[PDB]
Short mmCIF file of C-alpha atoms in Angstrom, two decimals:
data_model
loop_
_atom_site.label_atom_id
_atom_site.label_comp_id
_atom_site.label_asym_id
_atom_site.label_seq_id
_atom_site.Cartn_x
_atom_site.Cartn_y
_atom_site.Cartn_z
CA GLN A 1 -0.01 0.02 0.03
CA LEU A 2 3.07 2.17 -0.39
CA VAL A 3 2.48 5.47 -2.12
CA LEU A 4 4.75 8.40 -2.73
CA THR A 5 3.30 11.83 -3.68
CA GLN A 6 5.26 14.50 -5.48
CA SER A 7 4.12 17.61 -7.26
CA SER A 8 4.77 17.33 -11.02
CA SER A 9 6.69 20.66 -11.28
CA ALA A 10 8.34 23.35 -9.20
CA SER A 11 10.06 26.63 -9.97
CA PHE A 12 12.66 28.57 -7.88
CA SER A 13 14.54 31.89 -8.16
CA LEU A 14 18.29 31.53 -8.86
CA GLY A 15 20.24 31.54 -5.58
CA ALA A 16 17.21 30.85 -3.45
CA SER A 17 16.85 28.04 -0.93
CA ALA A 18 14.70 25.59 -3.01
CA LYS A 19 12.63 22.81 -1.24
CA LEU A 20 11.11 19.85 -2.87
CA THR A 21 8.51 17.65 -1.02
CA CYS A 22 7.94 13.86 -1.29
CA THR A 23 5.08 12.60 0.91
CA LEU A 24 4.68 9.01 2.19
CA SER A 25 1.50 7.13 2.61
CA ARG A 26 0.10 7.64 6.12
CA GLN A 27 0.90 4.15 7.34
CA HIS A 28 4.42 4.42 6.08
CA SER A 29 5.11 7.90 7.57
CA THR A 30 8.27 6.58 9.28
CA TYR A 31 9.95 5.16 6.25
CA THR A 32 13.34 6.02 4.77
CA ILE A 33 13.38 7.24 1.16
CA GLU A 34 15.72 7.77 -1.65
CA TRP A 35 16.07 10.80 -3.89
CA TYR A 36 17.19 10.57 -7.50
CA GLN A 37 17.92 13.12 -10.14
CA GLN A 38 17.34 12.68 -13.86
CA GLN A 39 18.43 14.62 -16.91
CA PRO A 40 17.40 14.15 -20.69
CA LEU A 41 18.57 10.83 -22.30
CA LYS A 42 20.34 9.76 -19.22
CA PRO A 43 19.50 7.31 -16.48
CA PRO A 44 18.54 8.56 -12.97
CA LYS A 45 21.39 9.10 -10.45
CA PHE A 46 21.10 8.74 -6.71
CA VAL A 47 21.07 12.01 -4.74
CA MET A 48 20.55 11.04 -1.08
CA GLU A 49 18.89 8.57 1.37
CA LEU A 50 16.68 10.42 3.86
CA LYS A 51 15.33 9.13 7.21
CA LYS A 52 12.31 10.17 9.32
CA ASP A 53 14.49 12.06 11.72
CA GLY A 54 15.95 14.10 8.87
CA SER A 55 19.33 12.43 8.92
CA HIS A 56 20.70 11.83 5.36
CA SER A 57 23.67 10.57 3.36
CA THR A 58 24.38 12.08 -0.14
CA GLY A 59 25.59 10.36 -3.25
CA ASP A 60 28.34 10.40 -5.78
CA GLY A 61 28.35 13.55 -7.84
CA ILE A 62 26.25 15.59 -5.48
CA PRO A 63 27.62 18.93 -4.11
CA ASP A 64 26.98 20.06 -0.50
CA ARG A 65 24.36 22.58 -1.37
CA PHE A 66 22.00 19.62 -1.37
CA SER A 67 20.54 18.61 1.98
CA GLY A 68 17.54 16.65 3.44
CA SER A 69 14.98 17.37 6.08
CA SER A 70 11.97 15.52 7.35
CA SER A 71 8.62 16.27 9.10
CA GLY A 72 6.09 13.49 9.71
CA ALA A 73 5.50 11.58 6.49
CA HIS A 74 7.16 14.47 4.52
CA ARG A 75 10.58 14.14 3.16
CA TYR A 76 12.26 17.25 1.82
CA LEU A 77 15.12 17.83 -0.61
CA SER A 78 16.63 21.22 -0.18
CA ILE A 79 19.02 22.96 -2.58
CA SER A 80 20.79 26.02 -1.06
CA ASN A 81 21.75 28.76 -3.49
CA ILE A 82 20.02 26.94 -6.33
CA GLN A 83 21.91 26.96 -9.62
CA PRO A 84 20.82 26.37 -13.24
CA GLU A 85 22.72 23.24 -13.36
CA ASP A 86 20.25 21.89 -10.81
CA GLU A 87 17.40 21.89 -13.30
CA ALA A 88 16.35 18.27 -13.59
CA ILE A 89 13.57 15.87 -12.61
CA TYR A 90 13.86 14.84 -9.01
CA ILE A 91 12.27 11.53 -8.11
CA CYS A 92 11.71 10.03 -4.75
CA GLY A 93 11.67 6.25 -4.19
CA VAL A 94 10.85 3.91 -1.26
CA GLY A 95 11.52 0.25 -0.63
CA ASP A 96 9.91 -2.29 1.84
CA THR A 97 10.11 -5.97 2.47
CA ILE A 98 6.84 -7.85 2.93
CA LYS A 99 6.83 -11.55 3.80
CA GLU A 100 10.34 -11.92 2.34
CA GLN A 101 9.12 -10.07 -0.73
CA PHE A 102 10.93 -6.85 -1.78
CA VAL A 103 8.64 -4.11 -3.11
CA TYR A 104 9.83 -0.63 -4.49
CA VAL A 105 7.71 2.31 -5.50
CA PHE A 106 8.82 5.58 -7.36
CA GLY A 107 6.98 8.91 -6.96
CA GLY A 108 5.88 10.68 -10.08
CA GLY A 109 8.88 13.01 -10.20
CA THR A 110 9.09 16.84 -9.90
CA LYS A 111 10.54 18.80 -12.76
CA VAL A 112 12.55 21.76 -11.45
CA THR A 113 13.16 25.04 -13.31
CA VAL A 114 15.42 27.82 -12.15
CA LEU A 115 13.94 31.30 -12.72
CA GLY A 116 15.54 34.73 -12.60
CA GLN A 117 18.37 33.84 -15.01
CA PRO A 118 19.68 36.46 -17.46
CA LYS A 119 17.25 36.62 -20.40
CA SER A 120 18.60 35.96 -23.92
CA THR A 121 16.93 36.47 -27.36
CA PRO A 122 16.93 33.65 -29.87
CA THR A 123 19.37 33.51 -32.75
CA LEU A 124 17.94 32.16 -35.97
CA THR A 125 19.87 30.21 -38.58
CA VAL A 126 17.97 29.07 -41.68
CA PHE A 127 18.89 26.69 -44.42
CA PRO A 128 17.28 26.19 -47.83
CA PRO A 129 16.64 22.63 -49.21
CA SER A 130 19.65 20.71 -50.48
CA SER A 131 19.92 20.15 -54.25
CA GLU A 132 19.94 16.41 -53.23
CA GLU A 133 16.48 16.62 -51.65
CA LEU A 134 15.09 18.73 -54.50
CA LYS A 135 15.93 15.92 -56.86
CA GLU A 136 13.49 13.74 -54.79
CA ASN A 137 10.85 16.39 -55.43
CA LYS A 138 10.86 17.61 -51.87
CA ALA A 139 12.18 20.51 -49.89
CA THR A 140 12.61 20.76 -46.15
CA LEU A 141 13.44 24.26 -44.89
CA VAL A 142 15.36 24.24 -41.56
CA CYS A 143 15.23 26.92 -38.90
CA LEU A 144 17.68 26.42 -36.07
CA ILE A 145 16.85 28.41 -33.05
CA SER A 146 19.67 28.91 -30.47
CA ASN A 147 21.09 30.94 -27.56
CA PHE A 148 17.73 31.60 -25.89
CA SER A 149 16.56 31.75 -22.22
CA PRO A 150 14.08 31.02 -20.74
CA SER A 151 13.13 27.90 -22.72
CA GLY A 152 9.65 28.71 -24.06
CA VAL A 153 9.21 29.58 -27.70
CA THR A 154 6.54 29.49 -30.35
CA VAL A 155 7.36 29.03 -34.05
CA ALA A 156 5.36 30.01 -37.08
CA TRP A 157 6.17 30.02 -40.76
CA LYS A 158 5.07 32.38 -43.57
CA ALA A 159 5.18 31.93 -47.31
CA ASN A 160 5.24 35.36 -49.09
CA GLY A 161 4.37 36.83 -45.78
CA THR A 162 1.21 34.74 -45.37
CA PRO A 163 0.77 32.10 -42.59
CA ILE A 164 1.63 28.49 -43.57
CA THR A 165 0.71 25.77 -41.05
CA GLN A 166 0.61 22.53 -43.08
CA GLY A 167 3.94 20.83 -42.93
CA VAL A 168 5.43 22.61 -39.92
CA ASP A 169 7.10 20.47 -37.25
CA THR A 170 8.82 22.13 -34.32
CA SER A 171 11.05 20.34 -31.78
CA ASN A 172 11.03 20.70 -27.89
CA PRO A 173 13.79 22.87 -26.61
CA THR A 174 16.98 21.39 -25.10
CA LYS A 175 19.51 22.87 -22.81
CA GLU A 176 22.84 23.84 -24.22
CA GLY A 177 25.01 25.23 -21.50
CA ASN A 178 22.65 27.42 -19.48
CA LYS A 179 20.65 28.45 -22.55
CA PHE A 180 18.34 26.61 -24.87
CA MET A 181 17.92 25.58 -28.52
CA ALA A 182 15.17 24.14 -30.72
CA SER A 183 14.58 23.43 -34.40
CA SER A 184 11.66 23.83 -36.77
CA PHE A 185 11.11 22.28 -40.13
CA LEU A 186 8.78 23.37 -43.00
CA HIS A 187 8.14 20.37 -45.32
CA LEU A 188 7.37 21.43 -48.86
CA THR A 189 7.26 19.95 -52.31
CA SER A 190 10.14 21.15 -54.57
CA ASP A 191 7.47 23.03 -56.61
CA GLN A 192 6.28 24.96 -53.65
CA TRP A 193 9.90 25.94 -52.84
CA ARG A 194 10.46 27.10 -56.37
CA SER A 195 7.15 28.97 -56.59
CA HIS A 196 7.48 31.45 -53.65
CA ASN A 197 9.38 34.66 -53.30
CA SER A 198 10.16 34.07 -49.63
CA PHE A 199 9.55 31.84 -46.77
CA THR A 200 10.06 33.12 -43.17
CA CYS A 201 10.71 31.42 -39.91
CA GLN A 202 9.06 33.40 -37.16
CA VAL A 203 10.07 32.77 -33.47
CA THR A 204 8.22 34.25 -30.54
CA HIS A 205 10.17 34.36 -27.26
CA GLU A 206 8.94 36.11 -24.09
CA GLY A 207 6.18 37.64 -26.23
CA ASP A 208 8.67 39.19 -28.76
CA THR A 209 8.97 37.96 -32.22
CA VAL A 210 12.06 37.62 -34.39
CA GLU A 211 12.09 36.60 -38.14
CA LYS A 212 14.49 35.20 -40.58
CA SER A 213 13.67 34.45 -44.27
CA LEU A 214 14.84 32.29 -47.23
CA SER A 215 14.55 33.48 -50.83
CA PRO A 216 14.37 30.77 -53.49
CA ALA A 217 15.59 33.28 -56.11
CA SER B 1 35.06 1.07 -12.52
CA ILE B 2 31.83 -0.77 -12.21
CA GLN B 3 29.54 -0.49 -15.29
CA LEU B 4 26.16 -1.76 -16.42
CA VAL B 5 25.94 -1.86 -20.24
CA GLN B 6 22.71 -2.66 -21.97
CA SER B 7 21.78 -3.87 -25.42
CA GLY B 8 20.74 -1.32 -28.11
CA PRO B 9 17.43 0.11 -29.31
CA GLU B 10 14.86 -2.12 -30.79
CA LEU B 11 11.71 -1.91 -32.90
CA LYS B 12 9.16 -4.63 -32.72
CA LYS B 13 5.68 -5.18 -33.92
CA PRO B 14 2.72 -5.66 -31.57
CA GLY B 15 2.47 -9.28 -30.60
CA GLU B 16 6.16 -10.08 -31.02
CA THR B 17 8.81 -10.81 -28.26
CA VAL B 18 11.88 -8.85 -27.25
CA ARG B 19 14.85 -9.68 -25.04
CA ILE B 20 16.97 -6.80 -23.54
CA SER B 21 20.23 -7.51 -21.87
CA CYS B 22 22.27 -5.80 -19.15
CA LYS B 23 25.92 -6.82 -18.61
CA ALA B 24 27.64 -6.10 -15.35
CA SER B 25 31.35 -5.53 -15.14
CA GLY B 26 33.74 -4.57 -12.25
CA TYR B 27 32.07 -6.61 -9.52
CA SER B 28 30.73 -10.06 -8.77
CA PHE B 29 27.40 -10.26 -10.59
CA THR B 30 25.94 -12.80 -8.21
CA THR B 31 26.17 -10.73 -5.07
CA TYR B 32 23.88 -7.82 -5.82
CA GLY B 33 20.17 -7.66 -6.82
CA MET B 34 19.45 -6.49 -10.38
CA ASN B 35 16.37 -4.36 -10.84
CA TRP B 36 14.43 -3.36 -13.91
CA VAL B 37 12.82 0.00 -14.33
CA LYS B 38 10.47 1.16 -17.23
CA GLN B 39 10.23 4.82 -18.40
CA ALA B 40 7.58 5.47 -21.04
CA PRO B 41 8.16 8.61 -23.18
CA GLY B 42 7.37 11.60 -21.04
CA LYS B 43 6.39 9.53 -18.00
CA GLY B 44 7.87 8.75 -14.59
CA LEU B 45 9.93 5.74 -13.44
CA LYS B 46 8.10 2.56 -12.86
CA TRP B 47 9.80 -0.21 -10.82
CA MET B 48 9.12 -3.54 -12.73
CA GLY B 49 10.78 -5.92 -10.11
CA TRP B 50 14.12 -7.48 -9.61
CA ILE B 51 16.03 -10.75 -9.85
CA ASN B 52 18.09 -12.42 -7.28
CA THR B 53 21.29 -13.04 -9.20
CA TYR B 54 22.45 -15.90 -6.98
CA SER B 55 19.24 -18.01 -7.07
CA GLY B 56 17.72 -16.77 -10.34
CA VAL B 57 14.44 -16.12 -8.55
CA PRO B 58 12.53 -13.19 -10.06
CA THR B 59 10.16 -10.85 -8.26
CA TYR B 60 7.68 -8.98 -10.34
CA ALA B 61 5.80 -5.72 -9.43
CA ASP B 62 2.10 -6.31 -9.83
CA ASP B 63 1.77 -4.21 -13.08
CA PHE B 64 4.41 -6.55 -14.51
CA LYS B 65 3.01 -10.00 -13.63
CA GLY B 66 2.09 -11.66 -16.88
CA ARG B 67 4.10 -10.86 -20.00
CA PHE B 68 7.46 -10.07 -18.48
CA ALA B 69 10.31 -12.46 -17.64
CA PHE B 70 13.61 -11.78 -15.89
CA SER B 71 16.40 -14.28 -16.33
CA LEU B 72 20.28 -14.47 -15.94
CA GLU B 73 23.37 -15.97 -17.47
CA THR B 74 25.69 -15.78 -14.56
CA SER B 75 28.71 -17.02 -16.55
CA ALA B 76 28.25 -13.86 -18.75
CA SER B 77 27.48 -11.53 -15.78
CA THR B 78 24.25 -10.65 -17.72
CA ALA B 79 20.68 -10.04 -16.71
CA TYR B 80 17.88 -10.30 -19.29
CA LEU B 81 14.40 -8.73 -19.61
CA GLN B 82 12.01 -10.51 -21.95
CA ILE B 83 8.62 -9.04 -22.84
CA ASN B 84 6.16 -11.28 -24.59
CA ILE B 85 3.18 -10.45 -26.72
CA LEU B 86 4.25 -6.79 -27.16
CA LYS B 87 1.88 -3.94 -26.83
CA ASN B 88 2.16 -0.30 -28.08
CA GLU B 89 2.42 0.85 -24.62
CA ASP B 90 5.39 -1.33 -23.86
CA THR B 91 7.15 1.43 -25.78
CA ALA B 92 9.70 2.84 -23.36
CA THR B 93 13.26 2.96 -22.34
CA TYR B 94 14.10 0.16 -20.00
CA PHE B 95 16.83 0.43 -17.46
CA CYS B 96 18.62 -2.06 -15.36
CA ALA B 97 19.87 -0.96 -11.90
CA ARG B 98 21.88 -2.44 -9.23
CA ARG B 99 20.78 -2.15 -5.65
CA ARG B 100 23.06 -1.86 -2.64
CA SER B 101 21.46 -2.98 0.62
CA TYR B 104 24.85 1.87 5.85
CA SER B 105 22.77 2.59 2.81
CA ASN B 106 19.91 1.27 0.65
CA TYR B 107 19.78 2.59 -2.95
CA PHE B 108 20.19 2.13 -6.70
CA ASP B 109 23.89 2.65 -7.06
CA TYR B 110 24.66 1.82 -10.65
CA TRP B 111 22.28 2.09 -13.76
CA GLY B 112 22.51 0.91 -17.23
CA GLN B 113 22.28 3.50 -20.07
CA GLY B 114 18.83 2.37 -21.07
CA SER B 115 17.50 0.37 -23.91
CA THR B 116 14.94 2.24 -25.98
CA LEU B 117 12.11 -0.13 -27.29
CA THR B 118 9.64 1.04 -29.85
CA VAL B 119 6.54 -1.15 -30.46
CA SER B 120 4.87 -0.14 -33.73
CA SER B 121 3.63 -1.64 -36.96
CA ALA B 122 5.64 0.97 -38.90
CA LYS B 123 8.66 -0.24 -40.75
CA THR B 124 12.32 0.29 -39.87
CA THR B 125 13.53 3.18 -42.00
CA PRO B 126 17.15 4.40 -42.25
CA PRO B 127 17.56 8.21 -42.41
CA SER B 128 18.17 10.14 -45.57
CA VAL B 129 20.99 12.54 -44.79
CA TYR B 130 21.29 15.85 -46.65
CA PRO B 131 24.14 18.39 -46.38
CA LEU B 132 23.17 21.95 -45.20
CA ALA B 133 25.30 24.82 -46.62
CA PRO B 134 24.41 28.48 -46.29
CA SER B 142 33.91 35.24 -38.74
CA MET B 143 32.11 31.93 -38.35
CA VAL B 144 30.04 29.87 -40.73
CA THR B 145 27.39 27.35 -39.58
CA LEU B 146 27.13 24.10 -41.55
CA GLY B 147 24.51 21.45 -41.02
CA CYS B 148 23.09 17.98 -41.71
CA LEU B 149 19.54 17.19 -42.05
CA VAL B 150 18.73 13.65 -40.84
CA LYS B 151 15.37 13.08 -42.38
CA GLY B 152 12.79 10.35 -42.18
CA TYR B 153 14.16 7.68 -39.92
CA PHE B 154 12.44 5.12 -37.74
CA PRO B 155 12.70 4.22 -34.86
CA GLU B 156 14.66 6.49 -32.58
CA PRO B 157 17.54 7.15 -31.93
CA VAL B 158 20.22 8.45 -34.08
CA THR B 159 23.67 9.73 -33.15
CA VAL B 160 25.56 12.40 -35.02
CA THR B 161 29.21 13.36 -34.96
CA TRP B 162 31.45 15.64 -37.04
CA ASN B 163 34.73 14.60 -38.58
CA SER B 164 34.49 11.25 -36.74
CA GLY B 165 34.35 13.05 -33.39
CA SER B 166 37.36 15.24 -34.09
CA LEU B 167 35.10 18.27 -34.36
CA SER B 168 33.34 18.63 -31.02
CA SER B 169 33.39 22.31 -30.10
CA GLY B 170 30.66 24.22 -31.86
CA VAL B 171 28.50 21.17 -32.50
CA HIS B 172 24.77 21.50 -31.79
CA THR B 173 22.50 18.49 -32.32
CA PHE B 174 18.79 19.36 -31.99
CA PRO B 175 15.91 17.16 -30.66
CA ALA B 176 14.03 15.08 -33.19
CA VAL B 177 10.49 15.91 -34.37
CA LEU B 178 8.10 13.08 -35.13
CA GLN B 179 5.38 12.94 -37.87
CA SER B 180 3.46 10.01 -39.37
CA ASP B 181 5.92 7.42 -38.01
CA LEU B 182 9.09 9.15 -39.19
CA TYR B 183 11.65 11.22 -37.21
CA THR B 184 13.71 14.07 -38.43
CA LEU B 185 16.38 16.10 -36.80
CA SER B 186 19.22 18.46 -37.64
CA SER B 187 22.83 18.81 -36.45
CA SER B 188 24.93 21.86 -36.93
CA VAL B 189 28.58 22.73 -36.49
CA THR B 190 30.13 26.28 -36.45
CA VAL B 191 33.62 26.66 -37.95
CA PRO B 192 35.77 29.57 -38.83
CA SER B 193 34.81 30.98 -42.29
CA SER B 194 38.45 31.06 -43.31
CA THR B 195 38.52 27.20 -43.00
CA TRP B 196 35.66 26.41 -45.32
CA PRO B 197 35.39 25.17 -47.97
CA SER B 198 39.21 24.88 -48.02
CA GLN B 199 39.02 22.26 -45.18
CA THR B 200 36.57 19.40 -45.59
CA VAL B 201 33.79 18.92 -42.96
CA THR B 202 31.79 15.69 -42.72
CA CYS B 203 28.86 14.71 -40.62
CA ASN B 204 28.63 11.07 -39.47
CA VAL B 205 25.14 9.71 -38.74
CA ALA B 206 24.44 6.39 -37.08
CA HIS B 207 21.00 4.68 -36.88
CA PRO B 208 21.53 1.71 -34.57
CA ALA B 209 18.08 0.15 -35.10
CA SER B 210 18.77 -0.19 -38.92
CA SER B 211 22.48 -0.87 -38.40
CA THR B 212 23.20 1.96 -40.81
CA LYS B 213 26.02 4.65 -40.92
CA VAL B 214 26.07 7.50 -43.24
CA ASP B 215 28.93 10.07 -43.95
CA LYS B 216 28.05 13.28 -45.72
CA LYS B 217 30.62 15.80 -46.87
CA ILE B 218 29.42 19.43 -46.67
CA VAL B 219 30.29 21.22 -49.86
CA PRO B 220 29.14 24.76 -51.08
CA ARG B 221 25.60 24.79 -52.44
#
């Protein structure tokens, strides 16, 4: 009947004392839990073991700004002076043994974002279709979006300054250094590429829009 | 210098069977429990159970009682996860993890094995060169299935200034782009090549970037 409850997301200001909560099921309020940290395309990594009295031991690769605290069924992971590198998903876990049978349960995980970082406007790099793709009667236009922070953007495309939505696919952002990047693709036929005066990648970031265009001519 | 190294990505059709492996090195395999953990795309971790590496006795979490089988080959220091009668929602990255039991925690993890369960066919990428102080060159890795692909530049010798972007997915085909930024004085006088690997189709593509 083991249950671990975690909020799905949390945000903290850069340099603040951040606190994440994992809550045990009532009947397991005295249990020792484990915290894990996970980044994109990587396995989780142990952060610390945390007991009901708040005592804790921290893992390989964890700096001492991380600490644990406890109150009742609640288990807290605190990060002093939180840094952008601390953005990750934090997952709590708990084990038990029941009639010689081991059981383990993970919480849902909490995605942590660090706010209050220096803002940075996107750089756009655009590429026309290759001659190789055009020979296959297709044209993919590529818009690489880089050097931006925070991570939220919206991307639209225009053809001769008019909205085009069919054939647009935009990636999620990923973290490079402390900033972010994403890509957007406009899939056309070769005839569409050849028939327009311009195509424009339009990126909105923090409510401000930047544009870069391709001219088939 | 303990490591857990898993088998590569796999694409399987619904109803088929897959066997994923996890090879331990740097310690005595039979002295620590090996656990299995499922992570569906965009979802949390789910403990599947564990296997006693001495006795070979598996323990399954309730949601994994049925189609799942843990086994061992102790002489190869390897644990296996077999999933039978595959379902679409078996699509996930599966991790093996060692448990130590001063402390109780998962102390070593495999890198993950990404399983895709789909009726769509394996498709190698089409790779296209992208040409226009610094210049940015690119490669478009178009229309592959399943994930993932890896991209390097000049066989890994070009690492600074490389950005590989997340894939997009549309109608059972993924596409991504990778870029490298180099001094304009060095191109095209010095050749630049992207190297793309698509493990699930056992394909490798080199593409030289030449002026358009």
